[PDB]
Amino acid sequence: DIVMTQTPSSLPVSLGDQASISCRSSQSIVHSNGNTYLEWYLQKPGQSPKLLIYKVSNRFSGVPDRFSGSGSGTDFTLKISRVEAEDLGIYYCFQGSLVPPTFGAGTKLELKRGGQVQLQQSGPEDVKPGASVKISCKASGYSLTTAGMGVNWVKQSPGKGLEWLAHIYWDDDKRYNPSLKSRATLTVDKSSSTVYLELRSLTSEDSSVYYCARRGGSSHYYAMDYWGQGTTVTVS
Numbered sequence: 001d002i003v004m005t006q007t008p009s010s011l012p013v014s015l016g017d018q019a020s021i022s023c024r025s026s027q028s029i030v031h032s033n034g035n036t037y038l039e040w041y042l043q044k045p046g047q048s049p050k051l052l053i054y055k056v057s058n059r060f061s062g063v064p065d066r067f068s069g070s071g072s073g074t075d076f077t078l079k080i081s082r083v084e085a086e087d088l089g090i091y092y093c094f095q096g097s098l099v100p101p102t103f104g105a106g107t108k109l110e111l112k113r114g115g116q117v118q119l120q121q122s123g124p125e126d127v128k129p130g131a132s133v134k135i136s137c138k139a140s141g142y143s144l145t146t147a148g149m150g151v152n153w154v155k156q157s158p159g160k161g162l163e164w165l166a167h168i169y170w171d172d173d174k175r176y177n178p179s180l181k182s183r184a185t186l187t188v189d190k191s192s193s194t195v196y197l198e199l200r201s202l203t204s205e206d207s208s209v210y211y212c213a214r215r216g217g218s219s220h221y222y223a224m225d226y227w228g229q230g231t232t233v234t235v236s
Contacts, residue, residue, distance in 0.1 A: 001026075001100060002025055002026050002027050002095055002098050003102060004023055004024070004026075004095055004102050004103060005023065005024045005026075006023050006091075006105045006107050007021070007024070008021055008107050009105070009106075010107070011107055012109075012110045013083050013111070013112060014111065015085065015111070016082050016083060017082075017083050018079070018080070019080040019087075019109065020080075021078045021091050021093075022077045023038075023071070023076045023078075024074060025074050025075075025076075027074070027098075028073065028074055029074070029097045035221070036071075036072075037095065037097045037221055037223075038056045038071060038093065038094065038095055038096070039051065039052075039054045039096065039223045040053040040067075040069070040078045040091060040092070041092045041093075042087075042089050043089050043091075044088070045089065047229075048228065048229050048230055049092065049162070049224075049227055050227065051223055051224060052078070053068075053069045053078065054216075054223035055069075056071045057069040057070075057071075058221075060220070065081075066080050066082050068081070076093065078091065078093070088110060090106045090107065090108045090109075091107045091108075092106050092107075092161075092162055096221075096222060100177055100178070101164045102164065103161060103164070106161055117140070117141035117142050117226050118139070118226070119137055119139050119212055119228040120137070120140070121138075121212060121229055121231040122135050123231070124232040125231070125232075125234070126234045126236070127233070128202075128235070128236045129203055129204065129235055129236060131202055131235075132198065132200050132202065133199045133202065133233055134196055134198045135197050135198075135199075135210055136194050136195070137151065137194065137196075137197075138193060138195075139151070139195070140193065144188065144190065144195070145190070147170060147217075148170070148215075148217040148222070149214065149215065150214070151167065151212055151213070151215065152166070152212070152214075152215055152224055153165040153166040153167070153186075153210065153211070153213075154210075155209070156211065156230070157207070157208040157209075164177055165180065165184065165197070165210070166184055172188060183201050184197065185197075185198040197210065199233075202233075202235045204236075207234050208233060209232050209233075210233055211227055211230045212227075213226065213227045214227075
């Protein structure tokens with residue numbers, strides 16, 4: 001099992017400053033075919049994460065020239081040349097090359113003090129311990145069955161960071177994270193283009209925000225280029 005290590009935990013900066021974040025893997029992240037799948041995501045304070053960099057070197061569309069991938073092998077570094085007010089948030093590094101894809105611990109960029117594809121998620125669910133939940137993600141602006149498309153489910157707990165939960169593929173290949181102890185079930189409604197995640201036995205540990213994200217094409221190297229706004233699940 002693979003562990004991403006994000007070196008700076010904090011790294012406060014001032015506007016217009018060089019910024020560098022590092023990520024290091026417990027094993028070589030590379031794939032049987034010619035490829036390291038490593039991504040950099042930005043999460044601004046009140047919002048879902050968003051894709052910055054994929055295939056370790058590549059800027060996703062809309063991402064300004066400030067950002068650069070600059071990694072190889074077991075060691076990768078994201079760099080911002082000139083920091084702007086927009087660039088403030090928590091940065092996560094992500095490996096997609098192995099079976100339980102793992103996120104980095106995060107790095108929070110904060111100011112120094114002084115001197116049309118869309119994914120829609122169902123509403124919040126409050127439930128009692130032992131109960132079950134079914135949350136939905138409705139994709140529009142594209143087709144779930146298009147080659148290369150997939151849907152990842154990722155969970156964010158307070159303080160526990162980002163954790164990968166499950167995946168469904170355009171051929172309806174469904175894979176889960178053994179951490180869930182087979183309590184998860186993915187299903188699909190093709191005509192409504194809606195993917196359903198079901199959690200079977202709930203404890204307070206399962207209380208988190210649940211995001212669904214689209215693994216992009218083979219063009220984006222299966223980086224998650226579009227995210228839902230999240231669904232808050234709360235266990236009494």
